[PDB]
Paper text:
In this study, we have identified a non-canonical ABC protein encoded by the rv3197 gene in M. tuberculosis, as a macrolide antibiotic binding protein (MABP-1), which confers inducible resistance to the macrolide family of antibiotics. MABP-1 adopts an unusual three-dimensional fold with a kinase-like domain and a linked accessory domain. MABP-1 is a homodimer with each subunit containing a bilobal kinase domain and an accessory domain. The accessory domain is indispensable for its function where it participates in dimerization of MABP-1 and in erythromycin binding.
The crystal structure of apo-MABP-1 was determined at 2.2 Å by single wavelength anomalous dispersion (SAD). According to a DALI search the kinase domain strongly resembles that of an ancient UbIB protein kinase (ADCK3). The accessory domain consists of six α-helices: α1–α4 helices (residues 1–120) and α6–α7 helices (residues 161–206). These regions are insertions that are not found in the canonical kinase structures. Crucially, the α1 and α2 helices in each subunit insert into the accessory domain of its adjoining subunit, resulting in an N-terminal domain-swapped dimer. The accessible surface area that is buried upon dimerization is extensive, at 2021 Å2 per subunit.
Residue numbers in the entry: 43 to 442
Amino acid sequence: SKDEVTAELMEKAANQLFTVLGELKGGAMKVGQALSVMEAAIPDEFGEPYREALTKLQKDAPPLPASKVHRVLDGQLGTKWRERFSSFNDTPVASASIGQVHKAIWSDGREVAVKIQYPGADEALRADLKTMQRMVGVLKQLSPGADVQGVVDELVERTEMELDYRLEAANQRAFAKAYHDHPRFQVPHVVASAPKVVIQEWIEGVPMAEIIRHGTTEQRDLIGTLLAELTFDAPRRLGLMHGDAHPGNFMLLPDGRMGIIDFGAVAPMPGGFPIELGMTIRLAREKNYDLLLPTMEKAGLIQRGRQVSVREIDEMLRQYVEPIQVEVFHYTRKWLQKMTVSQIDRSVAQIRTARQMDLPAKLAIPMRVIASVGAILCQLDAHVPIKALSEELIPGFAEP
């Protein structure tokens, strides 16, 4: 096809762009130059231990043979692991990030998904982490003006999240407890958890990706509205956001509930959804700039002590304001595209953005999640009563 190609070309362009972003905002030199420095400044002897580790992963390429699945299970649940099951299907039904998923029946008769990590994944990912740590050290010491603050911590955190299934299992447990018997959301219970094996209740539904491709209008509207609701309900209900969203995370169940099956990106929100956001959107809708600008500055949504353009503020907030100006908003790719085109031509005026590029965490986290969700709503072509959801669930949005 000519579309596979275009998709991969877009992926390529995005990675190129992010590499350039890293060069300009982080590494303080081009990646090739940095690489030359790194190769000079990192011992040759570290090369082979790196390579070997990657190799143990390349071996036994997906899917894993039955024997090795069984070996991982031996390692995590003990050599008598079969006693935990009524039956186990050796043929995987799906692939995961660094493992594969099997369908099985638990000893209590419940159907379960069993995620098995690939045996070579731990060593490979930790070797990769070590290499990137060394490289960060090289940049910090030898690349003038490099900003690598928080980078090693982020790498360690991501690596640990990929390698230890128990973390996501705990997130999922919090959610499964919160949404037990909920009329609209279904979270499968964690049946067992180990670093390299995690087992949860099996649920059958229509994948959101399928609805995005071929869904009926009603399927699209329903699962989109459910996702929108989850987004604001979760921090209100249990002080967590489900986090960075991807259609693989969700499904539409026969009874009209949305199944949520992945919890790797759960984000902390102890105080709930910050009131400043809903407040800002309400004031912006009303074009009450006299109150809007101080509210935003106090919140840290715009830079302090600056001359700002209300036109730029409007542009900044329109993607949040336009959907709640009608009872039911039609989230479309066309609209999102319109939201990407700037109102202020820079040849007309050379202003410095009022936008906050150092958002406070409590704002940055939900805003990022919301961006991913909104993009998904547009892919769904979903009609969503976001106005009513916002009034009901988002602090500060309803007229006081």
